[PDB]
Write an enzyme that holds these catalytic residues in place. Structure first.
Site, PDB file in Angstrom:
ATOM      1  CD  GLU A 184      -2.731  -1.454   0.102  1.00 38.37           C
ATOM      2  OE1 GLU A 184      -3.024  -0.468  -0.604  1.00 38.37           O
ATOM      3  OE2 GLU A 184      -3.160  -2.603  -0.130  1.00 38.37           O
ATOM      4  CG  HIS A 220     -11.055  -8.282  -6.933  1.00 34.74           C
ATOM      5  ND1 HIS A 220     -10.689  -9.161  -5.937  1.00 34.74           N
ATOM      6  CD2 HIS A 220     -10.168  -7.261  -6.879  1.00 34.74           C
ATOM      7  CE1 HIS A 220      -9.626  -8.692  -5.310  1.00 34.74           C
ATOM      8  NE2 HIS A 220      -9.289  -7.540  -5.861  1.00 34.74           N
TER       9      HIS A 220
END
Ligand SMILES: *[C@@H]1O[C@H](CO)[C@@H](O[C@@H]2O[C@H](CO)[C@@H](O)[C@H](O)[C@H]2NC(C)=O)[C@H](O)[C@H]1NC(C)=O
Ligand SMILES: *[C@@H]1O[C@H](CO)[C@@H](O)[C@H](O)[C@H]1NC(C)=O
Lengths: 193, 596
Positions: free
Chosen positions: B356, B486
């Protein structure tokens, strides 16, 4: 000793917009530049015309001090011989500029949650500004070959837009109060000492 | 005029979009970090305002010719503005799609299953099923959890997915595209010069041109794990057959990293899994993120912003508010960067922090580009940029430098072999899943699979491609693929296939630039500013230049390349071949554990 009114231009509740800066003629006063550092944290104090140390033993004629509020990216645009979006349409300085600039950050004073849109700047002026010209007028800017007669549409635009300051933008897009000083020695008896 | 008449329009558009898109991002962040009833309505209104403004600006910009006029930068910006996309629908279709997406999110967020023995105790997926799928060692209990999750959510998403795909194909057809699969594939079309050219049609033929060369590397890895899992559940494994779909380390099996303790070669050597050491030495989220930031500082990348620390979540909120614990890196706008993640003291979270923060660094890199070009070169670069840092941070030499590993630790043939096996279990294990999922969704969006054969084709291709078998047949009435985050949130998945190659290419390039010598899997680019500058000179480009040139600027290539990946995984192929001397390498569709 009659002090010079610097506290009422360095300590104000509200400054003015970029496109209409607030000039103030200062004369017949004892210029004490040491109290300028009394604030302390300055984003940029390196400044043109004179030596870094102020040399308080200098007697001038009337001195102009005009201030406004800009972003942090555009602080570097307040310099002689510097172009851009703010030094061509809003505020230009002479190439032989004498005097210099002061700027500091202010985010807990003039930036409120939800955005404050009281700060406005000019875009599309149709001609680069000459030194020390204001142009407060707000008429729609023509972009093309069609006579827009006061209605903003198609390819005719409104020249003013709002900053909309909010907290947590980061240093780049965060309010920065700027005040500049211009020193004049155009003959006459010297007053500002 | 055209050119000079469009420059003014872009100047108008930029400093209005930059202010009307910040409010939507802020409202979305507030809703995500604090779930109530006011925040949802605020987000709904802030999205509508931006959608209406974007629609008006796209309609205004569409009529600017572009036959042979303008500079390349203006042409790219104006074509990006013109392409429209999701706003070319009427109000009826727009509101139907919005409510379908909202219902998808509501169903997926709070899905629940209950223990058959204790009906009162019903568990969610984030705190209840993740732990079971990660650590539970009971075959029947794992099968129970898998069946419950496939039977609860799968019931409630089939008609929603049908309507959603119908609307998406209709919108893509209206947007001058063949289908929504072509809409997804259009991100790879590069056209800026001669030589720097690409086509939407050529992406699919490059996929299998790199899968077949990776296919026999996966077969030896799949067989070795299955033989290793023979003794884990001696009754519940058929060596003359595929692997169970629920004993894959997760709910679906995206990452096989949890299988490492059950497939480790050596048990005597110090375990490279340093979760125990991290727990013992007294680490916390602040320490983890400071260690992550020190790596980027050493490589020669900018420090984290002051507002990042004061605004990021980085920890479970506890308190009394409900949040979403899906890790994300947020670029709100105007210079605001934040990270939302529910960190725990493990190693998976330790690497996710690096991932991240790599996203955040790449977002910070192109802050000076124009608004319409403030994006990655293509959808498959963010993941690679994130992972080329975890690759260097996961090495035992780096682990020993920060003191996590003992100061008397010695690297040998055991350490390198174990490190390579652990890395392969994650990197190699996800490529078949990604390829299968993206291919299946592309066929669905092309409408080649009927509603009566969705499950049949999905499971047949899963059996003949990945090689995993099911414990009980799920009828066609369900919708298995919709159970993924997703799939339910409409996220592209081929980026997860292009990362698995771009990351290795970038890693080899950085290793060569850092004046390193030796094997590829001991690189550890640290305290070396050459690699940092070489990466930054392409990170700063943004979307201004074609992805072909963006790749070439660092790698010196113009397409995909598996040779760096094969170089990385060379020392494992030989060992697997030698150790599988008595292996029944090969899976079949006909063998199904259940009756009929
Ligand atoms: C989480 O959201 C709720 C509502 O969405 C917040 O509760 C209100 O917050 C607003 C913001 O100032 C104020 O009206 C009050 O503080 C709250 N309303 C009432 C009736 O108490 C809540 O504060 C949010 N949580 C956090 C940590 O910000
Ligand atoms: C500015 O004004 C405020 C309130 O009037 C005062 O507290 C502060 O000290 C002033 N700053 C100076 C005198 O430098």
């Amino acid at each position: 000793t009659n002090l010079c009114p610097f506290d009422e231009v360095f300590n104000a509740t509200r400054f003015a917009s970029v496109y209409a800066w607030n000039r103030k003629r200062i004369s017949n006063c004892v210029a004490d530049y040491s109290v300028l550092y009394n604030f302390a944290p300055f984003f940029a104090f390196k400044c043109y015309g004179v030596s870094p140390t102020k040399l308080n033993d200098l007697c001038f004629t009337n001195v102009y001090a005009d201030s406004f509020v800009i972003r942090g990216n555009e602080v570097s645009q307040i310099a002689p011989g510097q172009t851009g979006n703010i030094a061509d349409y809003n505020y230009k300085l002479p190439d032989d500029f004498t005097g210099c600039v002061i700027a500091w950050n202010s985010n807990k004073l003039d930036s409120k949650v939800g955005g404050n849109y009281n700060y406005r700047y000019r875009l599309f002026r149709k001609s680069n500004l000459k030194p020390f010209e204001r142009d407060i007028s707000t008429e729609i800017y023509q972009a093309g070959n069609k006579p827009c007669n006061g209605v903003a549409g198609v390819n005719c635009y409104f020249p003013l837009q709002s900053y909309g300051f909010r907290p947590t933008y980061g240093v780049g897009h965060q309010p920065y109060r700027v005040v500049v000083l211009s020193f004049e020695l155009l003959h006459a008896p010297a007053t500002v000492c | 005029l055209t050119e000079e008449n469009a420059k003014t329009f872009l100047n108008n558009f930029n400093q209005e979009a930059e202010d009307l898109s910040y409010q939507s991002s802020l409202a979305s962040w507030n809703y995500n970090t604090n779930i109530t009833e006011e925040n949802a309505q605020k987000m709904s209104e802030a999205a509508a305002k931006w959608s209406a403004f974007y629609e008006e600006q796209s309609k205004t910009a569409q009529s600017f010719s572009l036959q042979e006029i303008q500079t390349p930068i203006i042409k790219r910006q104006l074509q990006a503005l013109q392409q429209s996309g999701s706003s070319a629908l009427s109000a009826d279709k727009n509101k139907q799609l919005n409510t379908i997406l909202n219902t998808m999110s509501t169903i997926y967020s709070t899905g629940k299953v209950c223990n058959p023995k204790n009906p009162q105790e019903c568990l969610l997926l984030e705190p209840g099923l993740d732990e079971i799928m990660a650590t539970s060692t009971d075959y029947n209990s794992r099968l129970w959890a898998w069946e419950g999750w496939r039977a609860e959510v799968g019931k409630q998403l089939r008609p929603l997915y049908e309507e959603y795909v119908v609307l998406k194909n209709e919108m893509a057809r209206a947007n001058n595209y063949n289908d929504y699969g072509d809409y997804w594939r259009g991100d790879y079309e590069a056209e800026g010069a001669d030589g720097y050219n690409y086509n939407r049609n050529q992406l699919i033929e490059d996929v299998e041109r790199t899968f077949a060369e990776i296919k026999p590397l996966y077969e030896h890895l799949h067989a070795y794990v299955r033989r290793k899992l023979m003794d884990t559940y001696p009754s519940y494994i058929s060596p003359t057959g595929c692997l169970p779909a629920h004993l894959l380390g997760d709910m679906w099996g995206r990452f096989w990293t949890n299988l490492y303790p059950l497939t480790v070669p050596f048990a005597q050597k110090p375990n490279i899994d340093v979760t125990d050491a991290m727990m013992n030495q007294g680490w916390d989220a602040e320490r983890i993120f400071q260690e992550a930031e020190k790596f980027f500082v050493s490589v020669g990348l900018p420090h984290m912003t002051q507002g990042f620390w004061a605004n990021s979540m980085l920890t479970e909120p506890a308190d009394g508010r409900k949040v979403v614990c899906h890790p994300t890196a947020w670029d709100l706008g105007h210079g605001d960067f934040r990270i939302k993640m529910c960190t725990k003291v493990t190693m998976d979270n330790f690497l996710t922090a690096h991932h991240e923060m790599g996203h955040i660094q790449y977002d910070m890199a192109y802050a000076r580009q124009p608004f319409l070009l403030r994006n990655g070169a293509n959808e498959g670069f963010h993941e690679a940029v994130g992972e080329i840092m975890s690759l260097s941070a996961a090495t035992p030499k780096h682990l020993k430098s920060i003191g996590l590993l003992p100061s008397d630790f010695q690297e040998d043939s055991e350490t390198e072999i174990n490190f390579l096996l652990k890395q392969a279990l994650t990197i190699v294990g996800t490529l078949p899943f990604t390829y299968m999922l993206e291919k299946w969704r592309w066929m669905v969006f092309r409408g080649e699979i009927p509603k009566e054969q969705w499950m049949k084709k999905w499971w047949e291709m899963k059996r003949e491609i990945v090689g995993v078998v099911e414990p009980l047949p799920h009828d066609e009435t369900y919708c298995d693929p919709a159970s993924l985050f997703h799939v339910s949130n409409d996220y592209s998945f081929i980026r997860y296939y292009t990362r698995t190659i771009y990351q290795f290419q970038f890693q080899e390039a950085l290793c060569q630039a850092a004046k390193y010598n030796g094997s590829l899997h001991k690189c550890d680019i640290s305290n070396s500013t050459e690699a940092g500058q070489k990466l930054l000179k392409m990170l700063s480009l943004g979307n201004s230049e074609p992805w072909t040139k963006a790749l070439e600027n660092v790698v010196g290539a113009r397409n995909m390349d598996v040779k760096p990946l094969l170089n990385y995984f060379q020392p494992l192929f030989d060992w697997l071949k030698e150790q599988n001397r008595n292996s029944f390498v090969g899976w079949n569709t006909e063998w199904s554990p259940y009756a009929d």
